[PDB]
Amino acid sequence: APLKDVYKNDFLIGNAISAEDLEGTRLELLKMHHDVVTAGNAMKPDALQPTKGNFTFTAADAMIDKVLAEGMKMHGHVLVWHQQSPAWLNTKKDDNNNTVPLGRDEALDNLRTHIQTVMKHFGNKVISWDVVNEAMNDNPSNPADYKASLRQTPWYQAIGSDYVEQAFLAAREVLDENPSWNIKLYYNDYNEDNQNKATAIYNMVKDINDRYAAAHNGKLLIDGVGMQGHYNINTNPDNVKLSLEKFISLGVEVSVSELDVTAGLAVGQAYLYAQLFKLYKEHADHIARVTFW
Ligand SMILES: [Cl-]
Ligand SMILES: [Mg+2]
Ligand SMILES: [Mg+2]
């Protein structure tokens, strides 16, 4: 029995792939088991805009056209990240070879231009975008203050703590101009079963959604939270439940975006995969997708 068939009414079953998937023997297993795919590398910022104004969509287009041709859906990953993201977006070299943040006006223009050009280029070919990935520190000591809990990445240093909201606003504008496109906008993070981090993420989303909702008659700016699901055989499943119930109470949908269970035994994986799938089935009304990496 394919996972895809077992969870048909519950959630999409997904996989992360590359170009060499999609060929011959790998292609038939892909389709048999999965409804949705995410490109592992091909839609990241370094692959789509490697120098200023120079968008390179050929390889990504080829991949997405083939996935669509094959009857599967595509999840877009990722518009904004501090890894695999070219320096010119948010920094420059000063006179003495030191890399320094660009000003807020210039970096905000770059941020908005990258989000919007990418989202418009793919249009309705994706079912969802991870607009922002991994913006929160690990184990933040003060999750009551989400802005103080943000990782101080290059976007943060150029724009400040409101770059997350601005990124989602840039993406939301694209969807408002193109209401025929059915696309959910996600915020994505890992170690979501750390209760301080889940709390900081929940407070960030709630503050950003609330202010938006109050100005736009209850519409969400952030549609989804993605739990990456980089778990290990010692991952406590009650922690994953607390976090999931916490994200559900924001009225967002939830997805599991990069599920894998590594060592701290095959048996220990099975223990945890069953506890997780049990928990998902229980909350399937709120979970859109579960994707393995
Ligand atoms: Cl290319
Ligand atoms: Mg569901
Ligand atoms: Mg490309």
Side-chain angles (χ1 to χ4, degrees):
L3 302 312
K4 190 172 80 162
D5 280 39
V6 166
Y7 300 115
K8 54 189 163 306
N9 306 320
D10 301 284
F11 35 81
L12 292 178
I13 294 282
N15 195 219
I17 65 177
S18 62
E20 194 90 295
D21 303 304
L22 300 184
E23 198 263 47
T25 29
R26 331 288 193 68
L27 212 224
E28 278 308 272
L29 213 94
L30 205 290
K31 285 194 263 168
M32 200 198 207
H33 289 290
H34 303 90
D35 311 276
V36 57
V37 299
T38 299
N41 281 296
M43 285 164 79
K44 287 162 167 181
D46 61 351
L48 290 188
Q49 197 187 186
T51 59
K52 194 166 194 207
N54 184 2
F55 297 91
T56 51
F57 298 116
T58 301
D61 280 343
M63 235 181 66
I64 207 274
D65 309 346
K66 177 71 155 189
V67 171
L68 289 169
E70 290 306 306
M72 297 181 271
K73 292 167 165 146
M74 169 79 49
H75 162 69
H77 177 82
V78 47
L79 304 169
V80 181
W81 195 19
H82 64 286
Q83 302 194 1
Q84 289 179 271
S85 198
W88 71 264
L89 283 154
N90 45 39
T91 59
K92 54 140 175 294
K93 288 289 179 55
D94 77 0
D95 267 38
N96 298 280
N97 257 312
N98 298 123
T99 304
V100 291
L102 286 170
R104 169 193 175 86
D105 301 334
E106 180 174 359
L108 189 43
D109 172 66
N110 285 351
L111 177 80
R112 298 181 34 87
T113 294
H114 183 82
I115 290 165
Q116 297 184 329
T117 303
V118 173
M119 286 184 69
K120 281 200 257 167
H121 178 84
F122 293 101
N124 71 358
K125 300 169 189 206
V126 300
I127 60 156
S128 46
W129 279 103
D130 296 335
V131 176
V132 184
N133 202 27
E134 305 179 11
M136 210 53 81
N137 281 130
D138 282 308
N139 209 18
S141 63
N142 185 21
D145 180 358
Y146 81 87
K147 293 174 170 165
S149 297
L150 285 172
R151 183 188 327 262
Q152 293 191 269
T153 58
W155 287 116
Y156 178 100
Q157 297 163 58
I159 295 167
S161 64
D162 72 312
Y163 86 91
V164 180
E165 193 167 354
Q166 287 301 322
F168 279 100
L169 286 171
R172 181 62 61 203
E173 300 158 36
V174 170
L175 306 184
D176 302 338
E177 304 163 40
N178 300 278
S180 78
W181 306 349
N182 304 309
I183 300 177
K184 299 303 181 170
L185 297 186
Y186 274 72
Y187 174 73
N188 209 62
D189 226 323
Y190 61 88
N191 280 0
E192 63 272 9
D193 57 330
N194 177 283
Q195 302 305 303
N196 274 2
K197 197 184 202 180
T199 286
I201 286 161
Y202 163 100
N203 292 338
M204 168 177 72
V205 174
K206 189 185 178 347
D207 177 50
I208 285 166
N209 282 352
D210 279 9
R211 284 183 296 96
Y212 195 86
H216 293 82
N217 197 33
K219 179 163 184 33
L220 310 158
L221 171 62
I222 303 165
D223 298 302
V225 176
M227 310 180 91
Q228 279 179 27
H230 306 161
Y231 299 147
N232 65 78
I233 49 160
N234 286 333
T235 295
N236 191 340
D238 282 357
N239 276 321
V240 177
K241 183 187 168 186
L242 265 56
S243 280
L244 173 67
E245 220 180 322
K246 196 148 206 13
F247 296 144
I248 290 179
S249 75
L250 294 155
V252 298
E253 65 176 44
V254 165
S255 291
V256 183
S257 62
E258 324 185 2
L259 182 64
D260 198 13
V261 182
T262 64
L265 246 148
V267 74
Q269 294 164 318
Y271 289 161
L272 205 218
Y273 275 124
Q275 292 272 67
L276 294 186
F277 281 87
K278 211 262 260 83
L279 173 84
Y280 307 150
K281 225 196 298 27
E282 191 156 285
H283 292 98
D285 280 291
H286 302 290
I287 289 175
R289 173 168 51 87
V290 172
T291 295
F292 299 91
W293 195 279

